[PDB]
Amino acid sequence: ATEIRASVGKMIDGIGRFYIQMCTELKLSDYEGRLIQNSLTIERMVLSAFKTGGPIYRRVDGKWRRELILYDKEEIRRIWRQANNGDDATAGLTHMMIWHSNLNDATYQRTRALVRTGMDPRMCSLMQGSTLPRRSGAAGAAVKGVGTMVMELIRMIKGRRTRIAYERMCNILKGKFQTAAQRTMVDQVRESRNPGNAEFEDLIFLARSALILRGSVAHKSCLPACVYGSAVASGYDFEREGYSLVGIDPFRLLQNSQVYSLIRPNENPAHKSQLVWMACHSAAFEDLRVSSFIRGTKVVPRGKLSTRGVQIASNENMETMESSTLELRSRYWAIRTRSGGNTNQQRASSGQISIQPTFSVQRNLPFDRPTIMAAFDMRTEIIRLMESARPEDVSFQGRGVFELSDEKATSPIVPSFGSYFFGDNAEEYD
Amino acid sequence: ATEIRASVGKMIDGIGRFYIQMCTELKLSDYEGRLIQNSLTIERMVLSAFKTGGPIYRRVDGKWRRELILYDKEEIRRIWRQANNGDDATAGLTHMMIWHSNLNDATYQRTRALVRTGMDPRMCSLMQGSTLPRRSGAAGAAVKGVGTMVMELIRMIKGRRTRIAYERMCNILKGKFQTAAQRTMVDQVRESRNPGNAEFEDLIFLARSALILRGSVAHKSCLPACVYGSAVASGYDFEREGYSLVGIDPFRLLQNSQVYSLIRPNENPAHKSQLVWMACHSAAFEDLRVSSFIRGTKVVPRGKLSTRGVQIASNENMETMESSTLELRSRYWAIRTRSGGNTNQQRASSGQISIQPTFSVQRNLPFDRPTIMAAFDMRTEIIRLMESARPEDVSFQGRGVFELSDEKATSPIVPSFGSYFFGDNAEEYD
Amino acid sequence: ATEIRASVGKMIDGIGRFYIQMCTELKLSDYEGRLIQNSLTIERMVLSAFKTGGPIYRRVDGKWRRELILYDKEEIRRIWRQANNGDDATAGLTHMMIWHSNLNDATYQRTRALVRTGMDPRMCSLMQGSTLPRRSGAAGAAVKGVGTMVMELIRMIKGRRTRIAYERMCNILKGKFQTAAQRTMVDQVRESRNPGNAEFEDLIFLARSALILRGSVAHKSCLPACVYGSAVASGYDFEREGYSLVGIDPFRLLQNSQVYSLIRPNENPAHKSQLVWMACHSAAFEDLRVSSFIRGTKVVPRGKLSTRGVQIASNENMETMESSTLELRSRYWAIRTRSGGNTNQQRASSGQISIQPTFSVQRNLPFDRPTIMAAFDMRTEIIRLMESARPEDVSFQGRGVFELSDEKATSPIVPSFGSYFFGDNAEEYD
Numbered sequence A, B, C: 001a002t003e004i005r006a007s008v009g010k011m012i013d014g015i016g017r018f019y020i021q022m023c024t025e026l027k028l029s030d031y032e033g034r035l036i037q038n039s040l041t042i043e044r045m046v047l048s049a050f051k052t053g054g055p056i057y058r059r060v061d062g063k064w065r066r067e068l069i070l071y072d073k074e075e076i077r078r079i080w081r082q083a084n085n086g087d088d089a090t091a092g093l094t095h096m097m098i099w100h101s102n103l104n105d106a107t108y109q110r111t112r113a114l115v116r117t118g119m120d121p122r123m124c125s126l127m128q129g130s131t132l133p134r135r136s137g138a139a140g141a142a143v144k145g146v147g148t149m150v151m152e153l154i155r156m157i158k159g160r161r162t163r164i165a166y167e168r169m170c171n172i173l174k175g176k177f178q179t180a181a182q183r184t185m186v187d188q189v190r191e192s193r194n195p196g197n198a199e200f201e202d203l204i205f206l207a208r209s210a211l212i213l214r215g216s217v218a219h220k221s222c223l224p225a226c227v228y229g230s231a232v233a234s235g236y237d238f239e240r241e242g243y244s245l246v247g248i249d250p251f252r253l254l255q256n257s258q259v260y261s262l263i264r265p266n267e268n269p270a271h272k273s274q275l276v277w278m279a280c281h282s283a284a285f286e287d288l289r290v291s292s293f294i295r296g297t298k299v300v301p302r303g304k305l306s307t308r309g310v311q312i313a314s315n316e317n318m319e320t321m322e323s324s325t326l327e328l329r330s331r332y333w334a335i336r337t338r339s340g341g342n343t344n345q346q347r348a349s350s351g352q353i354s355i356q357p358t359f360s361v362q363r364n365l366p367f368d369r370p371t372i373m374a375a376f377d378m379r380t381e382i383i384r385l386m387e388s389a390r391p392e393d394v395s396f397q398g399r400g401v402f403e404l405s406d407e408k409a410t411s412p413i414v415p416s417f418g419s420y421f422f423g424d425n426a427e428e429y430d
């Protein structure tokens, strides 16, 4: 924990130094350095470098001006190595990849990718880290949803180091499943000599099962590089303080940070704020109800957002662009979880699914139809298992949100009770 | 379009002239002529004539008085032929039948008819035009719901011109189904030599399928004859202007019209207004949500209506009757559709049916159970097809309501979001 | 009716006299006598006596003091016999047992008992009178839920008077089922020579079926002894007036009564009030919606109650205890029913389960999926029967609540429309 916080704090400290360095190299003002569009281009450069460049936006003469700078990849690689105390440091690089993955997950529906791989486009909640490269870092493997893994494996199915790459990914997915039955099916997909349709079929089944018997996907709050750089510069020492991705740290960092974004004429700056907030806390596929309660303001579905992507294309013109503050703070904080919720146990039930009339009064007599009717080889075990589950079943018992003043997470608030971010479009009202 | 508007405008112009003529024949005042109960009796007469009569209500000495007039059928037939520029004109006659059908559909549940034919009384949404005679006009065929057709065909199943009548009706129903599978079943019902139980069974199946894979039923705004007559008299030329049943025209006509109704002591005049508004725009089986949004005031379920039928029986006494204005205007207008919504395509999905927990917080983890579990000869194709459909699936993409000032339907309003008119009674709370 | 009211009034009159007698024997003040915790201990004594005692709470020196008195069982038995005009009187004894049963049903979830017997812990609505002894009184048999009966029978399955005890209980349960099919299964469980697993399996099936095809369980408003005693003393004659358990009487009795309860520091006195109100009208497993409408204030789920049990354990200290008035009155009253609602008939349907689009507008097209899809040896009859039922189906047609001024129940109020009391806990959100 102390040791984990040590190295995590070491990599964020490295990202910070690099960004500051890069900001002076481009002679950007502090405000300009803290424009989300500038941070992404700088993030893109160091990721691409492992000549290159992209749009860098300057406040010039009361107007926003675009410029596509170019840097030698050898020079960037040097600047990254040296901001990270000599070492090559692939850790912070993958941390900035996961940040981009989270923003992608929050911005774009990847249905076109899903249908090509033979997957149902309603599996987006399984798709964390799908834009993240195949065989990324260990942290990248940790963060990838069940569907991402399944998608990657079918791309394979569609040179004996190909076999080990296949096996590694089978094992990654297996480690994500919380039931032995699902785990046993992955062994059957892995054990296959010369994989094909039966494996494809199996993986589609597993993906669908992961909608109810959800897998263990890690969630890591990853912030634009400018946030870390701004913190280092302002006097914060991530090596002395340590740092965490799943605890209070990132919430408390955003609470002391101010990030900006370029805003188009049609766009609501609050809606841009929601998007980058979601991305920051890897919350694209969270229940909107909890996202709201945590933030303090309503987290609206994608379809009701009066905004488009964070990045401003080379096509559109700068003379209409204004720049707004991003609202990334929260009312409460909550630990980020690796868990997919309850899947196992089935230790009794404890509840009520029908009523017994006491009074002679006209009314309907409510009962939980799917639950009552429900009770009337590894494939059928899974079927029976998800047939047993109910949307009403509670996970994370005893756990709750925390006040920002609660450093040590001592007094959990359990919240009382629109769930899907991608539920509202021209085809479906979910 | 111009040609369609020409003839439609010609038949409404004919109905108009006839009503004016009839109003002078009975020496009725303009107000009296625009009493819905008077219009229906005049409508009844010309329909029955193809001696006869019915109750005609006059404002006499500060009180409402009833009188059952009588006209020779030869004289009425002459008056109809001559108001329609010589010609026999069966078009306007069937237009006044469809108006009566729409009012019937809005007023009376026809469960007793449904059970005799072996049909489920919950199929009322399939029952448009069930009170309309068998083998009416082409417009009558167009307006009949899937269930009406099925009901008519079973009545048959329960003299070789009987065979062609059977075949015509099979083809009418077939032309209504939007899926080839349903269409293929109708061919199997039609092809049958000496039809019986298997056909009955097939038709019950098709009817049930039309609740999810809905058929193409035409909808035509048809107004009481007084509305058209009042318009002709006031200076409107339906031949010069043309006229439409599915566009803006009828909405804009009601906007410039004022209709009255006799009201009983218990009845709410607003609730009478809702009923005749629904009837007018053939909306008895529309979603209450859209009916409301269009009208601007809430369209309440049948069970919550403090009113009975428009027609006042010969039994009840006139001394308690008062007369109220009918409120038939709307906030918005919308094109009337022939479509039954989406049934085909299945081009991907694009949505979200489960959540992936990001935060360690106590809550249930919502998922779309029926949809996820769903994925686990022409009869089974249909079963699989309606098993694939979901209540959340969106039809009429891109289409919306219009401001009354928007003649050419240029700026569609897409509405944001109690659905069943016949959902609330002593047996069921739908 | 007059004869039934005669004897019922006779037993409540007996309970009343006994309580008054007991109150003087303990030299308690009227206020002290009307403390719910005192009444229960006195109720416990006469039930246990058929030496003994329990905690009796006195208001001493501005503080609440506890004392565990002791009485000879021979003396209590004498006091009960003599307050009941000589006779042994087992009737009032079982009436005080049913009162305790109702409070138990309202206070404690009995999942631990359910799981041992192999039953689903979600069957609590079937569990009326489970804490009531096996083979209680006839009134006790009447009041026991389907699940209680099933639980009792499995305890058996897990000395030929054992056979008759088995058969009596099979017949009790049978008399509760409203469908012949369920009744026929009980005959098959009863007819079994040397019962075992097949019977266990059968009874679990029947219990589950009783969640939809609900059985006839009697409900009797039974009040703490202090309420009856207080009434006798104040001048009310239950033999001259008669008395009822299912009519207006108990509501009207509570309306003229004032009961108290000891309250802990954390507890909301209103929430204590809800609990004892529910217990009093045997309403633990009623729909919360009707319980509310009747009472006039919201009847909250168990999980949202800031209270624990009525009885104060010997462990906890008296110096923190305060005493509050219990709010047991109601806005309306309603007859208590023996019925389990509709299970039979299936006389047509009359309703609407889908919509037919009239307007070309973007929206989803709602349909009742489970109902439409539903239509696609005694075990299968039951399956088909509960598959036919719907949560939306209305029972007790024409019946409603009454104003407290409406003695003869002349003007029924039919109510317009959270249902489960035990639906909210750390495992489930129902």
Ligand SMILES: COc1ccccc1-c1noc(C)c1C(=O)N1CCN(c2cc(NC(=O)c3cccs3)c([N+](=O)[O-])cc2Cl)CC1
Binding pocket: A231, A235, A236, A237, A241, A242, A243, A248, A249, A250, A252, A253, A256, A407
């Ligand atoms: C205690 O104050 C300081 C503390 C340190 C440095 C400067 C100050 C300081 N010097 O002047 C003022 C004024 C200051 C000040 O009050 N703050 C507010 C908090 N700030 C902040 C806090 C955190 N994390 C956590 O606090 C925790 C994480 C886990 C349990 S607590 C992170 N992060 O981990 O990323 C970033 C930032 Cl920027 C630092 C600046």
Ligand SMILES: COc1ccccc1-c1noc(C)c1C(=O)N1CCN(c2cc(NC(=O)c3cccs3)c([N+](=O)[O-])cc2Cl)CC1
Binding pocket: B231, B235, B236, B237, B241, B242, B243, B248, B249, B250, B252, B253, B256, B407
């Ligand atoms: C433009 O005005 C006139 C226009 C014509 C005649 C008189 C006037 C007129 N002369 O004086 C005043 C004052 C007038 C006036 O303003 N109105 C309001 C609209 N009225 C009306 C409009 C329609 N249809 C449509 O407008 C459309 C349908 C499709 C696109 S537009 C229908 N219908 O088709 O059944 C019935 C009626 Cl009654 C006619 C009278």
Ligand SMILES: COc1ccccc1-c1noc(C)c1C(=O)N1CCN(c2cc(NC(=O)c3cccs3)c([N+](=O)[O-])cc2Cl)CC1
Binding pocket: C231, C235, C236, C237, C241, C242, C243, C248, C249, C250, C252, C253, C256, C407
């Ligand atoms: C009519 O008044 C009296 C009537 C009798 C005795 C005294 C009074 C009386 N003497 O002075 C005042 C003042 C009085 C008074 O107004 N009440 C209110 C009602 N009280 C009461 C009413 C009932 N039942 C029913 O009323 C019905 C049950 C069914 C249809 S009506 C029950 N119960 O059956 O358990 C308990 C009680 Cl305590 C009795 C006292």
